[PDB]
Scaffold this motif. Structure first.
Motif, short mmCIF file in Angstrom:
data_model
loop_
_atom_site.label_atom_id
_atom_site.label_comp_id
_atom_site.label_asym_id
_atom_site.label_seq_id
_atom_site.Cartn_x
_atom_site.Cartn_y
_atom_site.Cartn_z
N UNK A 125 0.82 -1.20 0.00
CA UNK A 125 0.00 0.00 0.00
C UNK A 125 0.86 1.26 0.00
N UNK B 140 0.24 4.11 -0.09
CA UNK B 140 -0.43 5.28 0.49
C UNK B 140 -0.75 5.03 1.97
N UNK C 218 1.50 4.04 6.03
CA UNK C 218 2.69 3.80 6.82
C UNK C 218 3.52 2.66 6.22
N UNK C 219 2.93 1.85 5.35
CA UNK C 219 3.71 0.81 4.69
C UNK C 219 4.85 1.40 3.87
N UNK D 74 3.27 16.62 5.82
CA UNK D 74 2.72 15.47 6.58
C UNK D 74 3.70 14.32 6.80
N UNK E 101 -7.37 8.33 3.24
CA UNK E 101 -6.78 7.14 2.65
C UNK E 101 -5.66 6.65 3.53
N UNK E 102 -4.84 7.60 3.96
CA UNK E 102 -3.67 7.28 4.74
C UNK E 102 -3.96 6.64 6.08
N UNK E 103 -4.95 7.14 6.80
CA UNK E 103 -5.07 6.77 8.22
C UNK E 103 -5.85 5.52 8.72
N UNK E 104 -6.73 4.88 7.94
CA UNK E 104 -6.69 4.75 6.50
C UNK E 104 -6.14 3.35 6.24
N UNK E 105 -4.81 3.25 6.14
CA UNK E 105 -4.12 2.01 5.81
C UNK E 105 -3.38 1.41 6.99
N UNK E 106 -3.95 1.61 8.17
CA UNK E 106 -3.39 1.13 9.43
C UNK E 106 -4.53 0.60 10.29
N UNK E 107 -4.33 -0.55 10.93
CA UNK E 107 -5.31 -0.98 11.92
C UNK E 107 -4.80 -0.76 13.36
#
Lengths: 499, 502
Positions: free
Chosen positions: A217, A219, A221-222, A399, A488-494
């Motif tokens: 991903x 978009x 933290x990956x 950011x 989208x960004x915050x988003x790609x984290x659980x």
């Protein structure tokens, strides 16, 4: 015509390729804007643009697959494989994944994409929604292949051949280049799916901890983790040429053998290997083309398989430059070096030790049959400070670090639409106004990350398009663009600990 | 106005608040009447009721409050400011320089915890003032909030006030003898709102980028995020610490700094000025007619306690690391957190430091301890040496056949089988009025955890679970090893957002 190519009568007739392109010049942009560097690939008869036969490109595209590339000598290939094997053992564990169920593999088949050369139409044509299973001709076809695979009979590694209809750079169009699309037999895809899908999953869940970045991903933290991992090495960013056509059968065979060691033994696994590791057979009309080198783009797990191929290649290359300077290599290549790959697109962050002989690493790499360049088609490959990967440029922003999508990749979405096949990219396109709107809202959210100078360039283009196409856009407002990107960004984290 | 009270400096609050909650919710499981081999914990002493212990309700509220009277040595200003610059500038590089806008009244309200105490100037939980679909709040509470919001928008900051109670949990027996319960500071909702409006956007920025900042708050220990943490330790000498009595050793001047750091990442605005104003003010805890003012520490229950605490930890370790270097006459040119690898969750931490730093790490500790901190030695046996076995938040990082995992402490697991929460009561001995549905979920999970340790020792937990399920009249599907494993896997794969959404 077909003579001088490993071509034969297939005993079937698969039909010709589609004519035309799905691409339309936009209603708002009837005339070529300056800065546009992409245009639909050459589509044979009916573009007064160039005089190419479709079947010409095909054969031209096919020349590489006509004989094998040099490869990696079997002794070196074997060492390389232990580096690729031990390393991933250590991040995905030594666990062997149980094979998939017939129904399980089935619901994972891409319904929007051809059944291959033995059944016409798409997979979705034969899916019963109420039953939640495949039905009719395709179902019969799968059932039997599934059956034979359980008996240890492999399926045929067959493909319906075509050309990718897409936007390409102009010089490449002028040149008469177009990419090959190998639509793989639905049966083979199923058998392969059942075998390796659990392995692929583990690798993707863990991205970018393993050089196999598939499903990364960009978009999230990956991306930040990935960026972080390049610290304290010499960075080389590459994008090899014609990667898929340069792969060596014996290397693919090694990669499959690696994928295999993480799956638990089963006839289905064996046939998956047997199939995907023998020569490809692409059908078009009444003939088939049996490859003698190369990996078909569109084979099952081509991206995963490609990346492991890439690991193998680069590990061999490094292990070979150390040997011809009579220095031993101490530990694991992927521990010592830091590698990220997605097919032929990669980032190598190597240690000073390695970096000093990086010249013969390339010499070794090219000698295997590969063509390294130089992301930013930078005509000469050097160390850099600007990470570039999957058409992104790692950049510090208000950011934090972001993967900036190549601006051309962005702007081009305003000048062209994918829609109804035609011979005339200048005709009025049939299109879903709802979806086009969303497509361009996405583009804007992406451009937002570039900072307000380049964003303005886009807004300008956007406003003009929105009018011409009769669409109302929101992310045409710069504050709007930012927030959607951010979600989208915050988003790609659980978050909060799940259990 | 200011009198004494079993050694406590206290002052009539005017208002009454009434005493704190009667009893414990923990009963001992019907399948385990007799104490078990290696049982370490048991429910906190709770006085009025507790036939076990002869401490009173208001006895150990004093034993919890005792530290907060004696202010801590702290970090000397000159070191402090320097340590700040290291902390601030590092979190700038991974979360960027942008300034986050303050929350709108309703977003603020929406995130206010609904299960939870109302503060000390308003009655009942926050839920006893909420109606589902009418968008907002009602009652005295809606009024309280609405004023604070306008008083705060005009610079008049709310009160750093708390309704003291006594965390009912299971604590070490050795600690439960020494009269110790852990305090709970219920926060005035008005204050918890203003901070929320000020900081939630920043706290989120930190959490969403975990563990790339030593602020571990929010980390999913059961996902790839853990695997990242694990990698970030390779190459350093590893020290794992969980500090004794973290909250009450915190220094007002440290806390103040952290908050300004937080402020740096929010856009300047009266709401913000206010939250900082309130949160660096001495905390005061109302209990019935009286209240107590802190001369130092942190109320465990201030809005963003864990976040702020962890930024505190960054400051302390940076100052102490940089002090050590000074006293060895060795220049230290880099940023602390690029040179060293830190992870902090308020009290608990892991330091992966470079060799040079390791060689002088004793004196690092000496510095920390001198600011009035109390480091141990996470693994129960201290000193307090370099380990190869990462431990953090009750998890031991371990290679497994499915790749690295943070294995839950086994004694943390098996303990869940011996006790249960339920109804407030004077006994942990008597039959409970509990909810099989919730309990069954809890144990199934415990099992899902134990499965990561491998079959041999999982089987011992199965043993426990069988016997537990019988006394308690339950059925536990994860009594099968593959089911536990499957349900773990469910969690872990479900912790990573893939095929490029964007």
């Amino acid at each position: 015509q077909w003579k001088g190519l490993p071509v034969v009568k297939s005993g079937l007739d698969v039909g010709g390729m589609p004519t035309g392109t799905r691409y339309h010049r936009s209603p708002a942009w009837p005339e070529e804007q300056p800065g546009e560097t992409h245009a639909p690939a050459p589509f044979g008869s009916g573009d007064k643009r160039y005089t190419f036969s479709q079947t010409e490109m095909l054969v031209n595209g096919l020349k590489p697959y006509t004989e094998p590339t040099a490869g990696v000598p079997p002794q070196l290939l074997s060492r390389a494989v232990t580096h690729v094997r031990s390393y991933i053992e250590t991040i995905i564990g030594t666990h062997r994944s149980p094979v998939l169920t017939y129904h399980q593999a089935c619901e994972l088949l891409e319904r929007t994409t051809s059944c291959g050369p033995f059944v016409q139409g798409l997979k979705g044509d034969y899916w019963d929604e109420e039953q939640q299973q495949y039905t009719g001709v395709l179902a019969n076809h799968l059932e039997q292949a599934w059956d034979k695979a359980n008996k240890g009979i492999a399926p045929r590694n067959a493909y319906k051949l075509a050309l990718k209809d897409e936007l390409r750079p102009i010089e490449k169009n002028k040149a008469g280049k177009r990419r090959l699309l190998w639509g793989c037999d639905a049966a083979t895809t199923l058998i392969a799916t059942a075998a390796f899908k659990a392995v692929a999953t583990r690798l993707q869940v863990v991205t970018p901890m393993t050089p196999v970045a598939v499903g990364i991903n960009m978009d999230s933290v990956q991306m930040q983790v990935m960026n972080d991992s390049l610290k304290g090495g010499v960075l080389y960013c590459l994008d090899y040429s014609k990667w898929d056509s340069t792969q060596n059968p014996a290397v693919t065979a090694a990669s499959l053998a690696i994928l295999e060691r993480f799956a638990e033994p089963h006839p289905i696994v064996s046939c998956a290997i047997e199939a995907l590791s023998s020569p490809a057979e692409g059908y078009v009309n009444d003939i088939k083309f049996v490859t003698r080198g190369g990996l078909p783009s569109g084979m099952p797990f081509t991206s995963v398989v490609n990346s492991i191929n890439h690991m193998i290649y680069v590990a061999a290359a490094i292990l070979q430059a150390y040997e011809s300077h009579n220095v031993p290599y101490t530990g694991n290549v992927f521990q010592v070096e830091t590698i990220h790959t997605y097919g032929g697109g990669c980032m190598y962050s190597v240690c000073p030790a390695t970096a000093s002989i990086f010249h013969t690493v390339l010499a070794n790499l090219t000698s295997y049959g590969l063509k390294p360049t130089a992301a930013d088609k930078s005509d000469a490959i050097k160390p850099t400070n600007t990470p570039v990967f999957l058409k992104r440029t790692f950049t510090q922003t208000p950011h934090g670090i972001r993967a900036l999508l190549d601006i051309t990749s962005i702007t081009r979405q305003f000048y062209w639409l994918k829609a109804n096949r035609t011979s005339d990219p200048s005709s009025p396109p049939a299109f879903d106004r709802q979806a086009r709107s969303a497509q361009l809202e996405n583009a804007l959210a992406y451009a937002s990350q570039h900072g307000p100078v380049m964003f303005d360039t886009v807004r300008q283009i956007a406003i003009k398009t929105a009018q011409g196409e009769g669409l109302v856009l929101v992310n045409t407002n710069y504050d709007q663009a930012l927030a959607t990107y951010n979600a989208w960004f915050i988003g790609g984290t659980v978050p909060d600990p799940v259990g």
